[PDB]
Ligand binder design. Structure first.
Ligand code: NA
Ligand code: NA
Length: 425
């Protein structure tokens, strides 16, 4: 009933959403109140991130030996990097071959939204700063950001938004320490094992409300969009983005899973359908993590030791979907400006696009912030990001699904590559 209700909710939500806007006329305030049931689900899933991330990372690392944990972590990191690179290369090839921007002009495309003010050096240094928060309690709900102020002086401040990067790094180090302690640290292992189990049970309670929240979540966004002809001007740009995401999700990732794990990848992906559908509706890899936990464990029979480690980390640093999107968007913006891109310029977009949304799964405008960095790398104005924000919300839905799908396949791949370790213990 859990999966069926989710499918029923989207159909009713899409049916309700299209009918409401086509027949009824709603103001901006009336549109916001319509999506309120979905909004409640959004903050019920966000409420679970902190307890889930902390107890999963501590419990997963603490359960394994130091060497076993290191090898499992090394395998996951290689898979994260390997798949993100392939996603970027696929985006580069598709956008270069399809040439979405060479068939269009800058003037014709409408400009929407505001381009964020980003410093490439400060944004990347902020990544390392957030890995090591100054306060653990503050990191639970706030993040650090630095701005250049004046001959220039760096001023930093904390803003609302959970620092998943800092919490995961501490939870990994904390899990390693309490595991080595043994009997001394057993009480902490037991405490965070119960907290992890309790958090999963609370997710089960949230799943009861998810169908009703999903209905209004999908319905609301369909009603939010006031203009549909804007999607037609960027259709070629959208087509290449979804073509790359579809190929990565349906060809590349299943192929990698099959080679490492001699099993049907679509059977594995079928078990994740509930998590993939949730990601497609909430546009957050961290908020959909609790759903990914159940699908990987309950449906795909993936080891809980592997899942507790790979999934929380993957939701934070594994963004194949976003990395592909930045590579396609950056080259597309380059083509609009009639800017020929050489091998040197193409390469730098690849490395810059790789470091996309490394601490912003669910953070809004996370893709625009990265796009500014990627565009600035090869010298295009950061104001060209305004040409993409029109359809960024829709693409964000599909980005998150591919971001979550990469994590799910990583658990199966890492589990197979560490089979000797799990049996050895
Ligand atoms: Na990846
Ligand atoms: Na991810």
């Amino acid at each position: 009933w859990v999966l069926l209700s989710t499918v029923a909710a989207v159909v009713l939500g899409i049916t309700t959403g299209v009918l409401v806007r086509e027949h009824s006329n709603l103001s901006t305030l009336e549109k916001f109140y319509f999506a309120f049931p979905g909004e409640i689900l959004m903050r019920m899933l966000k409420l679970i991130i902190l307890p889930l991330i902390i107890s999963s990372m501590i419990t997963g690392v603490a359960a394994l030996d130091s060497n076993v944990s290191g090898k499992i972590g090394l395998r996951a990191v290689v898979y994260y990097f390997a798949t993100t690179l392939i996603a970027v290369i696929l985006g580069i090839v598709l956008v270069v071959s399809i040439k979405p921007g060479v068939t269009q002009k800058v003037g014709e495309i409408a400009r929407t939204g505001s381009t964020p003010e980003v410093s490439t050096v400060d944004a990347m240094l902020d990544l390392i700063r957030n890995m090591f928060p100054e306060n653990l309690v503050q990191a639970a709900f706030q993040q650090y950001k630095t701005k250049r102020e004046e001959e220039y002086k760096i001023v930093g401040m904390y803003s609302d938004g959970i620092n998943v990067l800092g919490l995961i790094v501490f939870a990994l180090v904390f899990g390693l320490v309490i595991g080595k302690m043994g009997e001394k640290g057993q009480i902490l292992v037991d405490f965070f094992n119960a907290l992890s189990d309790a958090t999963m049970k609370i997710v089960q309670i949230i799943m009861w409300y998810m169908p009703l929240g999903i209905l209004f979540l999908i319905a609301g966004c369909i009603i939010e969009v006031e203009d549909w002809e804007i999607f037609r001007k960027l259709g070629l740009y959208m087509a290449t983005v979804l073509t790359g995401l579809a190929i990565h999700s349906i060809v590349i990732l299943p192929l990698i899973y099959f080679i490492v794990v001699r099993k049907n990848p679509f059977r594995f992906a079928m078990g994740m359908a509930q998590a993939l559908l949730t990601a497609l509706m909430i546009s957050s890899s961290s908020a959909t993590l609790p759903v990914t936990f159940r699908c990987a464990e309950e449906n795909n029979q993936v080891d809980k030791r592997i899942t507790r480690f790979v999934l929380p980390v993957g939701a934070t640093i594994n963004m194949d979907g976003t990395a592909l999107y930045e590579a396609v968007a950056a080259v597309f913006i380059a083509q609009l400006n009639d800017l020929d891109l050489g091998i040197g310029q193409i390469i730098t977009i690849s490395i810059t696009a790789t470091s996309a949304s490394i601490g912003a799964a669910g953070v809004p405008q996370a893709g625009l912030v990265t796009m500014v960095i990627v565009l600035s790398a090869v010298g295009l104005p950061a104001e060209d990001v305004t040409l993409i924000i029109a359809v960024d919300c829709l693409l964000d839905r599909f980005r998150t699904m591919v971001n979550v799908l990469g994590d799910a396949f990583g658990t199966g791949i890492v589990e197979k590559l560490s089979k000797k370790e799990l049996e050895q213990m």
